[PDB]
Amino acid sequence: RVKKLINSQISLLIGKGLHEFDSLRDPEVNDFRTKMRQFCEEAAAHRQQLGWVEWLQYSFPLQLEPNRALLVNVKFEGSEESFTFQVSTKDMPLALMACALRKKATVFRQQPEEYALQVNGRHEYLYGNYPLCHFQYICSCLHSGLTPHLTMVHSSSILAMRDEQSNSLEQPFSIELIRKVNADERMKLVVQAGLFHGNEMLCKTVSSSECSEPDISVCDLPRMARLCFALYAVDCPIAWANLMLFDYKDQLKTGERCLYMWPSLLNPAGTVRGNPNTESAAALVIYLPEVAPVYFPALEKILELLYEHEKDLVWKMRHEVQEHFPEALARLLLVTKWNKHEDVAQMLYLLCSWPELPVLSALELLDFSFPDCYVGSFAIKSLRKLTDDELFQYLLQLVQVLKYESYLDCELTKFLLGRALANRKIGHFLFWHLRSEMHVPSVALRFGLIMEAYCRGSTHHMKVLMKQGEALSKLKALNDFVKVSSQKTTKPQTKEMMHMCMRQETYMEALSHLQSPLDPSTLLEEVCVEQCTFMDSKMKPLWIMYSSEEAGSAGNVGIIFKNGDDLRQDMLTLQMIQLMDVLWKQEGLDLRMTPYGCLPTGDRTGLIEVVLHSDTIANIQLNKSTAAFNKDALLNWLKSKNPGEALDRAIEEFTLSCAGYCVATYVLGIGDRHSDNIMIRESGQLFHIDFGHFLGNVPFILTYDFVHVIQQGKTNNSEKFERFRGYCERAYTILRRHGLLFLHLFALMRAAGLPELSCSKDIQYLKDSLALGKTEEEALKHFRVKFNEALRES
Ligand SMILES: C[C@H]1COC(=O)N1c1cc(-c2cnc(N)nc2C(F)(F)F)nc(N2CCOCC2)n1
Incomplete structure (x- = not known):
């Protein structure tokens, strides 16, 4: 019964019963199952005997960055008695752990190598021979001004987590075309067949002779040859179907085949497996002649x-x-x-x-x-x-x-x-x-x-992961309620009843105490029902807040649950912006980007990470207690959040991130940017949200309101403005040097079937925006023409 529980939990987690696999009676599925099970169990066993630092590398990998003073609060496990040391940003985590054990021995009237530093309230650790400045957490604390809070976890505590997480001839190729077809009965059905090795056609589309019920040698057929079929009417397509000529055991396939077709002429890239809906789908009856068995040469x-x-x-x-x-x-x-x-x-x-x-x-x-x-x-x-x-x-x-x-x-x-x-x-x-x-x-x-x-x-x-899926299951039930309710009562009324729903133990238990699907190192502890709400958009997205005492203000984390829209393109866009940031930072260029999390989790469902302490351009412009001129609203809001000495760093944060997002939205062809999908953080950082349109589905954009902030509110400011142009130019030239990387990754994404990433027309857009076929001087002059054209339009 230890396996019956494990298997039913697996079925529940993956959203497909394990019985559905057995009932296929498919030797291939069966051979993948048993081979991959042993492969995975071998790895699990290798992991159960790793050292305690090696186990830390496994479950909590270090979060790093692509001479100065630092006040750090450090405490131990099983003691509320904190201690604020004053370490340098150039010091290793071992120096702080020695400082902490020195202060621990001085208080309790009494070796740092048997310890690791945990970030409070997160599954994030600080260990290794890396100066504090290079750990993403210390770097983020230094920029935010906040005091790093750490906990001295011993090796006997880390090892207890590892111990708690246990368990032939020249005969030319030919087919015989021997079913629930749905098409115009007045016209006739025709099948076009093509031999393919990836994109390349091996010979030529041999079509068929024009109801509801209907040049290559065998010795030259490559190992991965695909026979691709297309059922049209005679040009209106009906269905497609592909299959591999050689089986998973390298043998040439022979005899009859029933090809369950996918509804739509030729689709080579399409899967070589039949439509699972073997009830309503149209089927093609074909026969593979007998070559002799013949197994592809070793x-x-x-x-x-x-x-x-x-x-x-x-x-x-x-x-x-x-x-x-x-x-x-x-x-x-x-x-x-x-x-x-x-x-x-x-x-x-x-x-x-x-x-x-x-x-x-x-x-x-x-x-x-x-x-x-x-x-x-x-x-x-x-x-x-x-x-x-x-x-x-x-x-x-x-x-x-x-x-x-x-x-x-x-x-x-x-x-x-x-x-x-x-x-x-x-x-x-x-x-x-x-x-x-x-x-x-x-x-x-x-x-x-x-x-x-x-x-x-x-x-x-x-x-x-089961705990995550249960939270996501409850979020869909709460979101469906929110959708129905919002179409019948006032927003305050719906918000109060969403809170009562959340306050049910079924929900308080499921929505609390889990790792964030957006970031396993962020722990979602207590759900703050009073702070949860929904946005007024079509799918009524939920805004869920969390708090954690153990982590202090850092445990205050927000997530957005969205059901009804696809989140894949948003995720892709954000991953590309994060890659640009990593490339820029690798060349000493920190544009202060904000690549927040976006993670699809199911059918038109996913999460978006809330960036707290931010508001949209449109909300800052319609302030809530003045500006004599609307052009001064953003600058006044920045002054509200950054008094005196701080205003300068905020205008700099704005300038750098504005240059980054101007180049990223330009290069990726992201249009429809307006005051609603552009936000500013209280630090000054400008960032974008909602990337539903990319690859021009786009000129360089210079917004007057942002140019006014970059110029410190001055009508004329060439020193500030041209420093901003330099940032755009540097970020665009660094991305050009890695143009092949974005093109290769975008080429791999053609497999996702995202509607705005469909044909070579979409990939051409990136080549033109990154002006790759040009010299670095000719591309920089071209970018200059498009940038100058954006200032005139501002
Ligand atoms: C400005 C607030 C208020 O009304 C919004 O709609 N907002 C949204 C909307 C969105 C968002 C982003 N992308 C996509 N595709 N969809 C959405 C949405 F949640 F509306 F479904 N994100 C935020 N963020 C908050 C700040 O940190 C980053 C995430 N807020």
Whole structure:
């Protein structure tokens, strides 16, 4: 009964019963299940014998940054008696722990290596040989002015958490086209079939001969060949269906197949698995002739065997390309004749001795343009260099790429699960990236199986994620109530009844004491029902506040629950802005950005992190007790929050972040920016919210109200204004240098099916906004023309 409880909890957590998997009687699903279960359990066991600092690295990974004084409050576990030391920002955490043990021995009338520093009320720790200034928490405290509050956790306490979290021939390829079709009975049904190796067509779309019931050799068919079908009417499309010619066991598939079709001509990128709705979906009846069994040649036997003329020169000096331009691998792989086994064996032989490639080259090889499993394994082999922080930075894209995957057991799934089971922060976001897509039939089996496998290697983490899902379940029930109620009573009345609903023990228990799905290190402790509310927008989003005594003012955390809108594009936009910030900070440029959390959790559902101490441009402009001129409202609000000496740092914070968001919204093509979706923090930091439109679905924007604040309220201020232009120019030139990184990641995101990231037209927008094909001088002059055009429009 220890397994019956665990399995039913897994079913509940992943949003799919484990019985649904068994009832498929699918040897592939069964073989992924048992192989991945052992893989995950091995990792769980390796983790149960790690050292206490290694366990800290696992569950609470360090939050770092991409000579000065510091007052720090430090206390111990099991004692309210705090102590305020005065350490330097250049000191290591071990120096503070020695200071704390010195003050502890002096009071209690009495070794810092057996201790770790916990950030109060958070699952965040400070340990290692890193100066305090470089820990994100100390950095954030220094800028905010706040005193860092830490707790001296001993090794015997950390080890108790580890001990509490236990458990053949030239015969040309041919098909026989032998069902619930719904189309105009007056016209006729036609099926178009195409052979594909990724994007590349292996031969030519062999269509069919024009009711409700209806040039390639077999020896040259590549390992990952796709037979792609399209049911049209004769141009109105009806359905599509794809399948792999070779099975998961490398054997060539033979005999009849029933292809359950997806409703819409050819969709090569679409999954190679049938529609699960085997009741209403249209089906195609096909037959695979008998070649003999024939299993795709092994690596041992395989290794034994731009204009048109430019591609033939790249292929001729293919060995010179490996030995002198190894990074040009994708250029030669994209020129290889994938419909000729003779050239594919010669090309795969080169890839077997090809040196490793930088992560930027590996992220390119993960695109759909490279479906070969050998070239794909080489990509994950180069992708292991990825640091846990870099892997987190691209985790969303690596999850979308699983949609291109042709079989369930794959080296990307093995890698993602291996890296997830070695870091609880990576296992956390991998969980939510898969959980949030469980309502999508095409990914539900794949994602459902991965989440199950992870759960086998993390039974304690499953219980922690269960607590999150229960909170999200209650938030949907409270949000549906709020939607119905708001259409029938005054807002104050609905707010009072939302609070009574929340005050029920079913809700107080479920909504309290959980890790935030937006950030596992933020602990959501007591829900402040008096401070919770909903916004007046269509989906009545909930504004939920939390407090924690243990963390003081830092435990005051807000989250926004939204049901009814897709949050993926917002998440993507924010991740890109965070990447820009990391790139800018890597080149010594801190633009004081605010890349707050956005995490989709389910069907048109997700969370948004509340940034407290901020208001919208429109609310500051309609102040609540004056400005003689509206142009002075923002500057006056900044004066209200930053008296005397402080006003200068606030105008600087505004200038830097304004330059960052001006460049980010410009480069990413984010339009429809107005006083409602632009906010200012009391520090001066300007940031944007609600990114429902990107890639021009856009000129540089210079708002007069912001230029007035940048100019310290002066009508003419070239010293201030031109320093601002320098920031825009630097941030735009740093992002241009990493243009290939955004293009590769955006190319990987084509797998997500976001409507504003659909064809090459959308990717072209980024190339033009980043002016990549130009020299750095010509691009900077072009940006200058578009920036000067924005000041005149201001
Ligand atoms: C200004 C406040 C008041 O009325 C709002 O609507 N507000 C919103 C709205 C939103 C938001 C952002 N993106 C998307 N797609 N949707 C929303 C919403 F919650 F409305 F659904 N976010 C905030 N933030 C608060 C400050 O820290 C960051 C998050 N506040």
